Amino acid sequence: EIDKGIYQTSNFRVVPSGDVVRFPNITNLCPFGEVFNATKFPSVYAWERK
Amino acid sequence: TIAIPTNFSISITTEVMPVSMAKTSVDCNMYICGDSTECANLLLQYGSFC
Protein backbone atom coordinates (compact mmCIF):
# COMPACT_ATOMS: atom_id res chain seq x y z
CA GLU A 1 0.00 0.00 0.00
CA ILE A 2 1.17 3.62 -0.85
CA ASP A 3 -0.73 6.87 0.13
CA LYS A 4 -1.27 9.75 -2.38
CA GLY A 5 1.71 12.17 -2.71
CA ILE A 6 5.18 12.73 -4.11
CA TYR A 7 8.10 10.62 -2.89
CA GLN A 8 11.87 10.87 -3.32
CA THR A 9 13.27 7.89 -5.21
CA SER A 10 16.83 6.64 -5.66
CA ASN A 11 19.10 8.56 -8.00
CA PHE A 12 19.29 7.71 -11.69
CA ARG A 13 21.36 4.57 -12.29
CA VAL A 14 23.26 3.37 -15.36
CA VAL A 15 24.59 -0.17 -15.85
CA PRO A 16 27.91 -0.84 -17.63
CA SER A 17 27.88 -1.91 -21.27
CA GLY A 18 31.56 -2.62 -21.93
CA ASP A 19 34.81 -4.07 -20.62
CA VAL A 20 38.27 -2.48 -20.81
CA VAL A 21 41.58 -4.09 -19.81
CA ARG A 22 44.86 -2.18 -20.10
CA PHE A 23 48.17 -3.81 -19.17
CA PRO A 24 51.77 -3.00 -20.14
CA ASN A 25 53.35 -4.70 -23.22
CA ILE A 26 55.47 -7.60 -21.77
CA THR A 27 56.66 -10.51 -23.91
CA ASN A 28 59.09 -12.36 -21.53
CA LEU A 29 58.32 -14.98 -18.80
CA CYS A 30 59.72 -14.34 -15.29
CA PRO A 31 62.95 -16.26 -14.51
CA PHE A 32 61.58 -19.01 -12.28
CA GLY A 33 64.33 -21.43 -13.29
CA GLU A 34 67.25 -19.15 -12.48
CA VAL A 35 65.87 -18.27 -9.05
CA PHE A 36 64.49 -21.62 -7.92
CA ASN A 37 66.87 -23.98 -9.76
CA ALA A 38 70.09 -22.06 -8.87
CA THR A 39 73.18 -24.36 -8.40
CA LYS A 40 74.43 -22.57 -5.20
CA PHE A 41 72.28 -20.85 -2.44
CA PRO A 42 73.92 -18.50 0.17
CA SER A 43 74.04 -18.78 4.03
CA VAL A 44 71.20 -17.06 5.97
CA TYR A 45 73.57 -14.61 7.65
CA ALA A 46 74.86 -13.53 4.22
CA TRP A 47 71.49 -13.56 2.47
CA GLU A 48 71.21 -12.23 -1.08
CA ARG A 49 68.61 -10.00 -2.75
CA LYS A 50 67.82 -9.77 -6.47
CA THR B 1 8.67 68.98 39.69
CA ILE B 2 7.87 67.05 36.50
CA ALA B 3 9.24 67.10 32.95
CA ILE B 4 7.06 66.89 29.83
CA PRO B 5 8.20 66.84 26.17
CA THR B 6 7.30 69.59 23.70
CA ASN B 7 8.45 67.99 20.43
CA PHE B 8 8.46 64.65 18.64
CA SER B 9 10.28 62.74 15.92
CA ILE B 10 9.43 59.86 13.50
CA SER B 11 12.13 57.07 13.40
CA ILE B 12 12.15 54.02 11.01
CA THR B 13 13.99 50.85 12.25
CA THR B 14 14.63 47.46 10.65
CA GLU B 15 14.43 43.91 12.01
CA VAL B 16 15.72 40.85 10.13
CA MET B 17 14.32 37.40 10.93
CA PRO B 18 14.98 34.00 9.29
CA VAL B 19 12.01 31.95 8.10
CA SER B 20 13.20 28.72 6.31
CA MET B 21 16.40 26.70 5.54
CA ALA B 22 17.52 24.61 2.47
CA LYS B 23 15.68 21.24 1.90
CA THR B 24 17.95 18.17 1.28
CA SER B 25 17.81 14.43 0.46
CA VAL B 26 20.38 11.63 0.66
CA ASP B 27 20.82 8.49 -1.44
CA CYS B 28 22.45 6.22 1.14
CA ASN B 29 23.33 3.51 -1.38
CA MET B 30 25.12 6.23 -3.36
CA TYR B 31 27.02 7.67 -0.39
CA ILE B 32 27.76 4.18 0.97
CA CYS B 33 29.08 1.55 -1.49
CA GLY B 34 29.10 3.81 -4.56
CA ASP B 35 28.26 1.81 -7.68
CA SER B 36 29.78 -1.46 -6.28
CA THR B 37 27.25 -4.40 -6.32
CA GLU B 38 29.01 -6.49 -3.62
CA CYS B 39 28.99 -3.64 -1.12
CA ALA B 40 25.29 -3.11 -1.88
CA ASN B 41 24.57 -6.74 -1.03
CA LEU B 42 26.60 -6.38 2.17
CA LEU B 43 24.55 -3.22 2.97
CA LEU B 44 21.39 -5.38 2.42
CA GLN B 45 22.82 -8.15 4.78
CA TYR B 46 23.35 -5.40 7.41
CA GLY B 47 20.16 -3.30 8.04
CA SER B 48 17.63 -0.69 6.76
CA PHE B 49 18.46 2.52 8.70
CA CYS B 50 18.05 4.44 5.30
Cα atoms found within 13 Å of the Cα of residue B19, Cβ hemisphere only: 2
Distance CA B3, CA B24 (A): 59
| Distance in Å, alpha carbon of A48 to nearest chain B alpha carbon | 43
The single-letter code of the amino acid at B10 is I
Q: Which of B20, B33, B35, B18 lies closest to A15 in space, CA to CA?
A: B35
What is the resolution in angstroms? Answer: 2.5
Distance CA B23, CA B15 (A): 25
* Helix and strand totals (H; E) in chain B: 2, 0
CA distances from A13 to A31, A36, B36 (A): 47, 51, 12
Contact A16, B36 (CB under 8 A): no
Distance CA B40, CA B34 (A): 8
Residue B29: its chain A contacts at CB < 8 A? 10
